[PDB]
């Protein structure tokens, strides 16, 4: 079939929000996201799975975590995850910081993606084109926390997760891997999949 372009792509399969974050995380470190245009998908794949994870998840009344798909969550609930992921730099640590001086939780080293109000903990997810146990490895030997926790997605529905606790339900890990399977077709059907991918290095 016909190549397309990934800025197609990029465009047309996520939300506006989600490219303009993307754009600026690219901007803060120096990258063109019309150069380095297999980059600015996995940054949008990234954005768009960790808020996917936190995506209906509330604490409620009594301090227990509930999920709640319905658009009105009640008024008393509270999010349980904090969003680390998609804020400039001082505005994430400024987060961070704060969380790790509130809860006594002590401050990583990089940035984490989220903060779990149930499991009070740090979470790093991944998003990988390669294998799971290969690709847990890099990040378990990058930040060496060993507070926060990993969880590892792959486009072909594989995970991997820090003593083998995967956090949330199946249903909810589910709708990312959907997701991700989702991108991948997509992705194959305009010729872009198979460098997508080869590029991860
Ligand atoms: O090549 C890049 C550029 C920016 C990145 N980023 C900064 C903040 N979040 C993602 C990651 C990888
Ligand atoms: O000004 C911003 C906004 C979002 C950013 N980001 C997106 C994904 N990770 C960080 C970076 C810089
Ligand atoms: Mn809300
Ligand atoms: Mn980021
Ligand atoms: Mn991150
Ligand atoms: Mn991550």
Same mark, same amino acid.
Not at 21 to 46: Q, S, V
Not at 67 to 91: C, Q, T, W, Y
Not at 172 to 199: G, H, V, Y
């Given at each position: ?64 975590? #509930?999920?709640?798909?319905? +658009?009105?969550?009640? !008024? ?8 680390? =992921?998609? &804020?400039? *730099? ?61 969880? #590892?997605?792959?486009?072909? +529905?594989?995970?991997? !997760? ?8 199946? =249903?909810? &890990?589910? *709708? ?26």
């Amino acid at each position: 079939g016909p190549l397309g372009s990934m800025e197609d792509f990029v465009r047309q399969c996520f939300n506006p929000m989600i490219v303009e974050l993307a754009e600026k995380a690219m901007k803060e470190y120096g990258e063109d996201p019309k150069i380095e245009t297999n980059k600015f998908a996995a940054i949008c794949t990234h954005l768009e799975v960790c808020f996917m994870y936190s995506d209906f998840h509330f604490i409620d009344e009594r301090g227990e975590s #509930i999920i709640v798909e319905s +658009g009105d969550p009640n !008024a008393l609930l509270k999010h349980r995850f904090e969003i680390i =992921e998609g &804020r400039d *730099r001082i505005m994430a640590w400024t987060v961070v910081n704060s969380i790790c001086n509130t809860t006594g939780v002590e401050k990583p080293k990089f940035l984490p993606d989220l903060y779990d109000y149930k499991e009070n903990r740090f979470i790093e997810i991944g998003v990988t084109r390669r294998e799971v146990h290969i690709y847990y490895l890099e990040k378990a030997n990058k930040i060496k926390s060993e507070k926060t926790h990993i969880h #590892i997605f792959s486009f072909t +529905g594989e995970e991997m !997760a820090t003593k083998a606790d995967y956090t949330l339900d199946e =249903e909810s &890990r589910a *709708r990312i891997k959907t997701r991700l399977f989702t991108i991948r077709q997509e992705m194959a059907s305009r010729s872009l999949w198979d460098s997508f991918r080869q590029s991860e290095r």
